[PDB]
Structure formats: C-alpha cells, structure tokens
C-alpha cells in the first residue's frame, strides 16, 4: 500500500553475473542494515563463471557494492589412499544467500565433487556447498554435508540407496532463530530430495581449510524413502521455518517438493527430527506447487500461517481452455493441535506466462495496522510481461483478495524482476519495513522504501 514507487534505490553488479538472483538483509554487530546479494555467474580467477557475493551498504543512491570474497580455487587432497576433488567452475556461488546474526551463508548449489581411487571413482557429481562468512572478523567456513568417499560400484549394489552425490545442497537455505542452518537439497537421495541441518557455531568450530571431508557430529540429515510418491520430487527445492505445533521450544520446517507424486507437487511441515506433521497436496500437475514457501502470521492471531506458490498453475477459462498464470495458496494455522484445512484463500495471476507466485515475501506490517502483509512476484507479469510485484495486506480473516499496491518492473524485458524478494526489515530506520527486489536478468537490485500511509 505505502511502498514508495517514485524514488527507488538501485544496486548493480557486473554484466552477465546474474547479480540479484538471491538477496537478503544483513545486520552487522552494531545493527546497521546492509544488503547481501548473490550473483551466481560472476567470473572467477580463470575468467570462468563461478558466482560471487556482494555486500551492499545502504545508500539512498545505491550504486556499486564491494565483494564478499571467498576462496574460488579447486582443491585436491590425497589422503587415505584416495583423491578428493572439489570443482568450483559454474558452481553458482550466490544462487542462495541468507543472513543470521552477524554471519552470512552463501551457497554454491552446483559445486561438483569426485573421489578417485586407482581406476574407480565416486563419479563427478554436484554435491553443492555453502560458504559461511563473518564479515567484521573475516572468519570463513564451509559446509558440504553431501560429500562422500564411497565408490560408484557400491551405490549400484545398493540400488542407489542413500545416494547424496547429486544433492545440490544450498539450492535453498534458511536459518532458525536459534542459529541452525537448514539447507534444501532437491537432488539428494537420487533426486527425491533431502534437508541438511547443523548449527552455524559447530560449522565454524569444526571446519579447517583443506580437510574437505570432516565430521560435523551435531548435524542432522533427513532420510531416504522407498515410497514411489517421492521419486523425482525435488523435496527441498524451497525451505522455510516456523512455529506450527504449539511448542515454542521446537522449531518446525516447511519444505517444498514441487514435483512430488508424479509432478503433482506438495509442501510438508516437519519437526526438527524430520517427522511429517502436515502435507499440502498440489492442485494441478506440473503447476510446480511448492516452488516457493513463506511463513508469516497474516491474521494477527499470533499463529504462523503458510503460503505456497504454484507459478505454473493453469487457470480455467471460457470454452474449456486453460491459461498458465500462477497461483498462491494461503493456509491459516488453526487453534491448537489441528490439521491445516483447505486453502483459506486463493490468489491467481492474470498475465499469461507471468508466473504469479514464483516468490512470496513476508513484509511484516507494512501499513502499521496490526496485521502482517506479503508481496507476491510475477517475474514475467504485468501488461508488458516485464515483471510485477503485488502487495497483499493482512486482515483478521487472512489476506485481502485484491492487491493494495502493484510495483511494475523498472528494468527492461527479461530482467526477471521479482525472481527474488525480501522484506520485513527497516533499512532506512524510518519505522516502516521495506522491500528489496532482485532482477538477475538485468544484474540489478531495486529497493522500495515504505513511507507513512
């Protein structure tokens, strides 16, 4: 409603770097808000794509940002009569970024890994990896829970059970309030998907450069399954956390599986032990139900509510014809321990191929009315197809069905304006939470400052 669309703030990265593919707010140890920006095709030392991370100080004029430097060199370790190998070319460093406390976690989902032992090998596979940084102290750490040293032959003997070689860990990421990093790995267990959790403190204390394979005893991974409903389900394409079991001691996980059960898609709510509490099923096959998930209490009852995006949902129109527009689903959490019912509200896009619901960002209480609000992205929506971000205000019965405000892309065609979103942080310290929007196609980030209503 009250975001300012006249005086925006633009940040920019190198051309072709996909600057803005992912973004997050970052508060330093002093509470000064900056913007961490992932650029997963930034050139590395060998003039080759490796990705990169940028830490943008808040300036009303925006502009260029300094780099958050990481080690981009391939590693080789000959230990235990084996050969460990990391491959960082086209790893996509910055495809996901997330900030917790004074720590930044940037992941390279397509970092490859291999283990040679004489004429056998583990196969060169995208295990993924995440880089951790404490900018003020310069501390660096890494986390790659899906690396293994098992040779290819063993997986064939076990019919490829517990096969984490293609995790792409860090594809999605989130940190609990307690400081536990939770990584989505949609390729884990031979593309069923998995979650990897470990405390940030233990990741730092147990990491040393060069080891490549080390034990993080406090870590916790989800489990493989023989249920065909999960085969090729990409469990972990999107992840989020919230409070859904009435126990404020436990943190619950929200996972997206957009191809679950033969591309029907699903979203599951689990406890910290990966025991399923709820399952939300897709409405239409190939709609990619679960591409994005968002957790926020919208109706002001203190209970976290759920939002699921299905960017490829095909709306039914006249003369028995379908139209891909996208759809977002709102599930209000019922009082006490009860199952989430049917969707409390359906929001459906209007522009053909707009992909309404590609990203859903909690905004906090934008207009300061006591109810939390959300922003939904249609990266190829709007009458021009250039991209649109729509704001929906919370209310006692959930969300308003019509948007209070529509932000049209200020970038040219193909920018993918809205592919990434982040809100609920007051960057200019004016008392109103603001919104940062990524447009990796134009290698830029736009900041919308909220103003008095």
């Amino acid at each position, epitope marked *: 409603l009250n975001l300012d669309p006249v005086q925006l703030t633009f940040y920019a990265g190198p051309n072709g770097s996909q600057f803005g593919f992912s973004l997050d707010f970052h508060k330093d140890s002093h509470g000064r808000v900056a913007i961490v920006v992932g650029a997963p095709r930034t050139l590395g030392p060998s003039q080759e794509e490796t990705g990169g991370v940028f830490l943008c100080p808040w300036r009303a004029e925006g502009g260029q940002c300094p780099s958050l430097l990481f080690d981009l060199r391939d590693e080789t*370790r*000959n*230990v*235990g*009569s084996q050969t460990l190998q990391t491959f960082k070319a086209r790893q996509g460093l910055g495809a996901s970024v997330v900030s917790w406390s004074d720590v930044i976690v940037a992941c390279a989902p397509w970092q490859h890994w291999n283990v040679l032992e004489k004429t056998e090998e583990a196969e060169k596979t995208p295990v993924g990896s995440c880089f951790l940084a404490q900018p003020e102290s310069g501390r660096r750490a890494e986390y790659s829970p899906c690396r293994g*040293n098992t040779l290819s032959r063993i997986y064939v003997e076990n019919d490829f059970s517990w096969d984490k070689r293609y995790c792409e860990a860090g594809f999605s990421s989130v940190v609990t309030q307690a400081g536990e990093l939770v990584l989505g790995a949609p390729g884990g267990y031979y593309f069923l998907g998995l979650l990897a959790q470990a405390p940030v403190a233990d990741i730092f204390s*147990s*990491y*040393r450069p*060069g*080891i490549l*394979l*080390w*034990h993080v*005893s406090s870590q916790s991974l989800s489990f493989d399954s023989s249920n065909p409903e999960y085969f090729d389900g990409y469990w972990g394409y999107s992840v989020a956390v919230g409070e859904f079991d009435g126990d404020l001691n436990t943190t619950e996980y929200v996972v997206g599986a957009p191809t679950w059960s033969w591309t029907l898609g699903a979203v599951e709510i689990l406890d910290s032990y990966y025991q399923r509490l709820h399952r939300l099923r897709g409405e239409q096959m190939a709609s990619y139900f679960g591409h994005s998930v968002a957790v926020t209490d919208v109706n002001g009852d203190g209970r976290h509510d759920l939002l699921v995006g299905a960017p490829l949902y095909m709306e039914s129109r006249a003369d028995r014809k379908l139209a891909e527009v996208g759809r977002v689903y709102l599930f209000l959490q019922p009082r006490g321990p009860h199952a989430l019912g049917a969707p409390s509200l359906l929001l459906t896009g209007t522009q053909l191929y707009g992909r309404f619901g590609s990203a859903i960002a909690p905004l906090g209480d934008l207009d300061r009315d006591g109810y939390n609000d959300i922003a939904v992205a249609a990266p190829y929506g709007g009458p021009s197809g250039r991209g649109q971000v729509l704001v929906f205000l919370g209310q006692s019965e959930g969300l308003r069905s019509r948007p209070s405000q529509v932000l049209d892309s200020p970038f040219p065609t193909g920018s993918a304006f809205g592919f990434s979103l982040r809100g609920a942080v007051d960057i200019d310290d004016n008392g109103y939470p603001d919104l940062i929007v990524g447009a990796y196609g134009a290698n830029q980030v736009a900041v919308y400052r909220a103003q008095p209503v």
Partner: antibody
Amino acid sequence: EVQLQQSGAELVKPGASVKLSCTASGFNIKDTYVHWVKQRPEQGLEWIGRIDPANGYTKYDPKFQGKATITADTSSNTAYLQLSSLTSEDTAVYYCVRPLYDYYAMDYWGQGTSVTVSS
Amino acid sequence: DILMTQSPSSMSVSLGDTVSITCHASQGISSNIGWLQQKPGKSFMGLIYYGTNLVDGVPSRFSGSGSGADYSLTISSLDSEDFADYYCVQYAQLPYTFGGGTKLEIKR
C-alpha cells in the same frame, strides 16, 4: 564427551583366539571410522586396520592379514578386534582410535587393552 | 609403505625451553600427518591433525609445521606435564604408519 571404553586385560595361551571390544560412549560408533593400533616397547606403534561400522567395510595392513579380524555391532555400539593363532609376538597393548573432525585423522584413543600370550 | 623417521629418539631439556620434534616421510604426504602424546604409563592423547591443526583442548604452546616430507612439533615453554612420549603418524596412504617416537626427559 567422546570416550572409547575398551575391554579389560587378556591373558591367553599360544594358539588360542581373543576378541577385544571397544565400546563407544557419548557418541554413536557408526559416526566415524574406527581403527585398531598395536603397541610394543621395541617395535613401537603399528596400524592394524579400520572399519566403517555403518556398513562393515574394513581395511587392513597386510602384515595382519589372517591374524586380525575387525568387526562392529551398531546394536551394542561396539567395535571388535579378533586375534587368532596367538603367539608371543601378539603380546602387546591394543588401542581403538577414531578421528575428531578430519575423516582420516587419528585423534581419540581408548585406554588400551593389554594382551599377554604365554603357556 | 611410507616410512616415518622421527628424531630425536630422546632429549634432555628443562622447563621453559622451546623444543622441536621432527618427522621425515619417505615421500611427500602434503601435511596429512598427526602428532600424538603419551604421558608415562597412560594412554594416547592427540595433539595435531592435518599438519597444523590443534585438537580441541590442546594448549596453544603446541604447534605443528612443515610440508612435503618434513614436519615438526614445537612446544613453547615446556610444562612439567609435557615430559612424555610423542609420535607422528601419516595418513596420506594406507596402511597408516607411525614415527619411531620421541621421549622428553628432565635435564639435571
């Protein structure tokens, strides 16, 4: 706290067999590699072999091929070392080892099990 | 197998001295080495892993260095509890092989 608790001292005759136990405490034996090391005053420290308790796969120094047999039981959270065809040269102190962080290191050691072979 | 030559066999030193124990491999092992301590009559306690990394709890006066086939364990300002046996071990190749050992003794 990680602790490796090994079985007590053994006093056996030549030609017999003995089976040493190394029980995990404060952690699951399945977490890491588990090694066995032999020690003597003159010959020093010799690496016998390792086991991955999660799957049972093992590695040995070929010097102990036939004499030593390393096994593990995740049920009882214990790793084992069986020595067959015992000789005075098998009289030694035997340790079980597991790494701290590095997958391949040798950082945590049990208290050692004493074996004496004599008629 | 990889041969680990450790030196010296023993040394007579005093409290506060800065002593170094060397370990030489028969081939390059690229810091895939660990250092161990065995106090008199007691079990083993790991000090260093992967060349230079201190095991959790080990005092900072211990420090490992070196590369290729030559490594060192340096103790700054010896404490009374530092008079013990010390060993190196390579884990670059199977089978793991240990150094001969070094005994620190009190000079008088």
